[PDB]
């Protein structure tokens, strides 16, 4: 996060760290959706142009964290992965369309003050909140600067931007499976996701039931905080049946 703030304690209880076993390292963000399922971006696991391709073994999931770097002695929980599922039509060859993946943990995790799942939107929720101008929230332990590392979990609040405007800022082909978010240069107010933030949640708080909903997955952007540029996210409601389906077939 660029131009964000340190999170309060128990502010984003679904926040998950995707951690490399060796070299022990911060891969990306992710989000907890039940006691045995985690949601992240497909590009955190598979990116052939960069020879990136992680399996279950290469990874560790860390839940309940606040500090980036410290072992959080009786707070955090470490989980091992049972299976990885990537969307079958994830397009890595051209615009990262359908950038989504599920993670099935070996054993159910126990909730606590610092560990709790976020909700998945229903058609009606998507319908009233996913509007240009409405603000959502992004969290992560990523870069603070385009070109260091924060000590604690960062937070930033950003507005959804109109499709045309999104379309008009890049030479990449945007899909219905994407949405862009950020402040305009006019609006002079700023912030963005940055390297290492990838795959965490874009959440909204519903005014009807006062519940937190995950609408986006931090997907891609050009630079971090660049004027006239925006952050792109995987449109979670549009991939809901695929999600629904893998949980139906392989789990819960």
């Amino acid at each position: 996060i660029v131009e964000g703030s340190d999170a309060e304690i128990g502010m984003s209880p679904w926040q998950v760290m995707l951690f490399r076993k060796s070299p022990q390292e911060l891969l990306c963000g992710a989000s907890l959706i039940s006691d045995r399922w985690v949601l992240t971006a497909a590009h955190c696991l598979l990116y052939p142009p960069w020879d990136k391709n992680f399996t279950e073994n290469d990874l560790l999931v860390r839940i309940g964290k606040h500090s980036r770097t410290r072992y959080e002695r009786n707070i955090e929980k470490i989980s091992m992965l049972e299976k990885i599922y990537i969307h079958p039509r994830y397009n890595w060859r051209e615009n990262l369309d359908r950038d989504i993946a599920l993670m099935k943990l070996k054993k159910p995790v126990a909730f606590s003050d610092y560990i709790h799942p976020v909700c998945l939107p229903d058609r009606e929720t998507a319908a009233s909140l996913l509007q240009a101008g409405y603000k959502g929230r992004v969290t992560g332990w990523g870069n603070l600067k385009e070109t260091g590392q924060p000590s604690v979990l960062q937070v930033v609040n950003l507005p959804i931007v109109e499709r045309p405007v999104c379309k008009d800022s890049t030479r990449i082909r945007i899909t219905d499976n994407m949405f862009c978010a950020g402040y305009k240069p006019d609006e002079g107010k700023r912030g963005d996701a940055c390297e290492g933030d990838s795959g965490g949640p874009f959440v909204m708080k519903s005014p009807f039931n006062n519940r937190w909903y995950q609408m986006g997955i931090v997907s891609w952007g050009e630079g971090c905080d660049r004027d006239g540029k925006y952050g792109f996210y995987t449109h979670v409601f549009r991939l809901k049946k695929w999600i629904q389906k893998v949980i139906d077939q392989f789990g819960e």
């Binding site: 022990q24 390292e25 911060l26 560790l60 770097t69 410290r70 072992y71 470490i78 091992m80």
Partner: peptide
Amino acid sequence: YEPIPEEAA
């Protein structure tokens, strides 16, 4: 990054 206790994994 502090190491993770063999007793956490």
